[PDB]
Design a protein around this ligand. Structure first.
Ligand SMILES: Nc1nc2c(ncn2[C@@H]2O[C@H](COP(=O)(O)OP(=O)(O)OP(=O)(O)O)[C@@H](O)[C@H]2O)c(=O)[nH]1
Ligand SMILES: Nc1nc2c(ncn2[C@@H]2O[C@H](COP(=O)(O)OP(=O)(O)OP(=O)(O)O)[C@@H](O)[C@H]2O)c(=O)[nH]1
Ligand SMILES: [Ca+2]
Ligand SMILES: [Ca+2]
Lengths: 156, 162
């Protein structure tokens, strides 16, 4: 239920191991920096950071091309830690300043399937972008909490 | 040293995604709204603070470990009376850093992993929490079990509240 929204999750790979290695002082510095970078890039594509998960973010966009372009630019900027990015779209409930519903959970699982450095999108996102964006042929996976399988597409 | 000492409690609903898929978004939103208010109310009764939400769970801060455990116990009692959702609870203490409306640092991450280890319906606490509550006349623990926690080297003994 709810309004249609594109949901993007970012997540740092193995952030606990990282925190343990470099220590809390360096980690807070790092994540503050990362937060500012992500916020900047999200805003450039007219997105809004909805919520923090500590070593990652939940971001809302009106259009799928905005989300994917944001993901592309974030990976580019990081190459200048490894981050996984997943993107899904569908109706979700935007209540208080949070997002809820099965399509939020699905975006979350799509991000969880992504490798560090990868941008993964669900089939609805892929099908909506058939403007400067190329995809692989997809991979079929089971997603925790959902029945059956889903084809997820990596951005090239 | 960086950070203020705090007791961190995480709650998490077991298999919330599958639950959401069963009951639908409308009923889910109503359910988690009710859950949010239940947790918030019980937390404030033990002088705690809900720091942040993880959708189907919360990060909560307490000054004292007795407060966190009493809260956990009361929450499980409330959830039993209500019953269907099962909530896992994990508690750890140490210094952590506040940034915005969230807590950061290895001891937050540790609390998170202690919670992840807990079964639905269970309260697990780390060894420092158990040790801090040795003298308590009301709080009782089991003998503990050794685990390894993602992101951390070595092993850690975790204790269930009885
Ligand atoms: N501030 C804040 N931190 C959170 C929240 N939810 C989770 N965390 C933190 O997120 C971290 C755990 O993230 P994970 O991604 O599971 O851990 P990881 O070590 O990165 O492992 P992988 O991503 O699986 O490689 C812990 O530090 C948690 O304390 C939140 O809502 N707010
Ligand atoms: N609103 C909100 N939701 C979050 C946040 N972090 C994670 N989530 C949600 O948390 C849910 C996934 O939680 P999990 O505990 O991994 O899923 P689960 O199905 O309960 O699985 P188990 O706990 O392993 O049994 C998804 O619905 C995510 O969208 C957050 O910061 N804010
Ligand atoms: Ca991570
Ligand atoms: Ca859960």
């Amino acid at each position: 239920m709810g309004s249609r929204v594109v949901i993007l999750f970012t997540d740092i790979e193995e952030s606990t191991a990282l925190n343990e290695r470099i220590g809390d002082r360096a980690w807070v510095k790092l994540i503050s920096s990362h937060d500012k970078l992500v916020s900047d890039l999200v805003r450039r594509q007219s997105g809004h950071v909805v919520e923090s998960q500590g070593d990652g973010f939940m971001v809302a966009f009106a259009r799928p091309e905005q989300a994917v372009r944001c993901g592309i630019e974030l990976q580019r900027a990081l190459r200048r830690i490894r981050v996984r990015i997943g993107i899904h779209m569908g109706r979700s409930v935007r209540r208080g300043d949070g997002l809820f519903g099965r399509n939020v959970a699905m975006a979350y699982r799509v991000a969880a399937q992504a490798a560090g450095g990868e941008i993964l999108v669900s089939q609805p996102v892929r099908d909506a972008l058939s403007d400067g964006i190329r995809f692989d042929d997809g991979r079929e996976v089971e997603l925790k909490g959902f029945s059956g399988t889903y084809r997820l597409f990596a951005v090239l």
